[model samples]
Target chain A: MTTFLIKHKASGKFLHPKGGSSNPANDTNLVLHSDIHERMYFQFDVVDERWGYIKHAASGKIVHPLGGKADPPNETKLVLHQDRHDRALFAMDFFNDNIIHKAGKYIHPKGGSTNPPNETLTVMHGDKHKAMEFIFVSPKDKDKRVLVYV
Target chain B: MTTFLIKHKASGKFLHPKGGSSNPANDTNLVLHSDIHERMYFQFDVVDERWGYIKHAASGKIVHPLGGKADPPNETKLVLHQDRHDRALFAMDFFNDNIIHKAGKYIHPKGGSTNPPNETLTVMHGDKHKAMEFIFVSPKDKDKRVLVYV
Candidate 1:
């Protein structure tokens, strides 16, 4: 089993869920960060042939993009789910560099900027673009557990 | 999107679905091969929360692990399907290193042998085991599109 720190190549940071007491479970916004933490490490496990779940190593929570069939626009606030439901599932394309939310929108940084660690990640659609890509970086050294972007 | 060669670490061979006219689709026995081919390359696109379909790059068919809830033991032959159904789905675990057929059995090499290149890949039950692990190798030097096991 390999633990992955999904580094948004465009953002140059890892996917970070709000795991603090204030955020609570299933209600926190998914933010991006350059540093590594237990909450940032994820288990890229496959669900069916195409969909997979990005799980938080520390909390055992699934990375869920908000909304389902009728999800609002730009509502890509990342949440955690206990159950592996459709919302918790994602269609990942390591090659295309973007994750497609069940809503059929591409997971994009709220803004084009990658700076400022607390930047929010949301879902959007329309023509394919460079912002849609994401890179799954496996643990460089298991003993050290550090995430490398390149 | 980047194409991937799914290699069974235990067998050290790429998944080779019989592409010959004699085998045909939906009834072909998927064999393991040390060499690479357009048929072995797959696009793992997500469908729902952790579940996705494995589409053969060459044939454009899905890997259908036989049976839903009623598939018998060792009867889970990796076949090709034109439509994406419950049987065509697979639960992939990069965490544990294997893809479990939707029937709940882990996809393991018929035995732990990678020789002869015609060894069969099948499904079985039990706790996390080494045979279940698979390595997704991205095509190296795009010109060759080779999938390596080491």
Candidate 2:
């Protein structure tokens, strides 16, 4: 039940949904901001022990990765929702340092590892992708965390 | 604009205005939650070199102190607003540890230094008040900062 600010380990940016909309999936664009704030803060509550809901702190929005059997590198939509439904549940694959959706795609940055401002976030194949690794950043420590995972 | 996760140095909690309402004083109870998240993140954008606005990240609310002229101390309100009007402007008294409202009261916590949960936030006489002193806690270190004042 620990709420934290998640930083993209590769981009050096905080992961937050685009816009401050009260509705979920307004744009379905998971993006990174160079700055840290309440919008970047989140709660990773345990849903089924290791798997849990990634709730947005500011709006209480839940994050979800799109479903369907699209393999061989498909552009899966990363969206936010109002409920902790099955699609909203995600499992933390700490061993590989990636947050895998219940359907198995990895939460990843849209582009390469080098971080620039306003990088788009997306889901990808979780097969040992280091770009999906994340760190729970402390509010006081911009470059530090309690550990790599929540 | 840089968004910061503000932690109550005394309580070891974050300041989040409960209920993301559009009204400035609607649900004005500024409570402290044990976790860090979007509701607790704020932006301190400088209006001038020494003055600024403490904008909340989620609802786009800004912090403001109530109007009054008392010396012995009174329960001044530390409310949030949806506008950047003159009453919303604030000056940073860098020489001391106080966020002095343009109307003149100093931003202070409702209770003593001992932080209990949901301690109502209020404003007090800005004349060398001790309970209102706050340090900008760093994300990487609980005590680090770029500079004491902004």
Candidate 3:
């Protein structure tokens, strides 16, 4: 039942759906922002110990990489989509701080820029980038939600 | 983020995964009981307005009809399974108090008996049964959760 904000390690920004609309349409691009908007909050529906569905807290839409498994080369923007597809599934590797797709891709900020603009887009990258590293920040009080990395 | 106990309208008992194991294995049949066991609590992850995945709060497995979309006639017991398949999807018809599967089947207690045994199995039936009616009860408090028919 706990909602979290995904903070990019380097930028210290939270992941948000582009346009900041409460009723975001499917395929809305994902972006990074410094503000802690309600739409930026998410709930992790753990399908397993490692993999699960990341749902937008307000809209309830699932996050996935655009183009899915057959995403065109160099066009791997992440987007919010309906929960009907397998692409909505993601693996959270707390040890390495990576959110991964089944296609062996990591959630990477656009252009691998660490301190990008407020609306910098997120993409799925085949290689690991420093910008791909993220930490889950609970929206609750700072000391309430603890992340115990074992 | 709230978890609920599904109470059968006729029996006034909660639906639970059979055996009450915290780490229940896949394909464990579902049943009705009067106890408010932890295994009986469930979280509804909404995929849309009506359809979503019903997750066991203790084991985190998904509930689905045993044979899935190709379920043979007369063998439609409901069971828990991994959350990777479309069969895990279910529709909640609040108006009729029915929990439905995507294959047009309704969840019916065995033999359409209202006051069945504690472990009476629940199955997916092609026809509606009085025992199929259920209501969502919040585990928080008696007057905490309100059911809005609108």
Candidate 4:
């Protein structure tokens, strides 16, 4: 049997690849089952760090096609950007933590002035797949042994 | 009464010189005002144009202390960038408009990325104190020119 890891569209959530095949003991498994759609939807719960592992996925939790309501617990799907012509449409929280974007919540890290609720801040997205994974970082984890992608 | 153009923190708002004097209306009719806080804020409203006379303040309504919550009807605020020492800000909208920081939305000429946002973007009472005031762009308008404190 072949296996692959899926990512989220808005967050960089992905199950560690080293989980190995043949019923790996760790959680964060990608259980796949056939749906009416051409593809199968992956399943796993993103219920905080408490159940920070994949279980039901190992048993064949009926993979639903990668569509419909985008929620946590379920594996992620990919998306893309149109104009940039460079990057893909993927999202992974650099920090395991998450931040919700509303009217003018997240401020741009570059510009000099500001924008009111009426303005918009453009950001970079993935070129191919949708990503929805996020991470959390604490002051202790600030530049610890943990490696980061450039 | 003596008047001053006191910058009201990061709101990007200010009042006209309280007691000093109002500048003579130049071609740009641009004015300068400062407050006892030793701070100053700049505001301008440019009209939307096709080739030149481009749209000013395409962002949204701005609140000025001396001016009030009403946005300039025909003109938009002139945007700029500043250095480390609190000197000047830049804005080369004819080339690019920067909307990266806590201020503004974008730095695009027709929303195109051609020039630098800081190359001509700036503000006051927010991050840096250096600012950029709006003026006419012609010798005929003695006030029509870019002013840099550095």
- Which one wins on lDDT? 3
* Per-candidate iRMSD: 12.3, 13.1, 7.7, 21.7
The deviation in Å at residue A149 for candidate 2 is 8.3
Runs of candidate 1 exceeding 4 Å displacement = A1-150, B19-24, B67-72, B114-121, B124-127, B141-150
| CA lDDT for candidate 4 | 0.22
lDDT of each: 0.60, 0.59, 0.75, 0.22
What ranges in model 2 sit over 4 Å off? A20-27, A67-73, A147-150, B1-150
Candidate 4 chain A least-lDDT 10 residues: A80-89
lDDT of 4 by residue, A1-150 (tens): 222233221322232212323233322223211111112212223222111112223444222112312231212321111121111112112223221221111212112112212111122222222222223221232122111111
**Residue B93, candidate 4: alpha-carbon lDDT:** 29
**Worst ten in a row by lDDT for model 4 chain B:** B47-56
Candidate 4 CAPRI category: incorrect
Q: Across residues A64-142, which tens digit of lDDT does each residue of candidate 1 receive? A: 6665344536645666666676666666654355676655666666765545356465545533666556776656632
DockQ of each: 0.04, 0.03, 0.10, 0.01
Candidate with the larger TM-score of 1 and 2: 2
How close is every model to the real structure, measured as TM-score?
0.46, 0.46, 0.58, 0.19
Per residue, candidate 4 scores C-alpha lDDT tens digits across B43-81 of 332211111111112112222211211222212333321
Docking quality class, candidate 1: incorrect
- Which candidate leads the pack in DockQ? 3
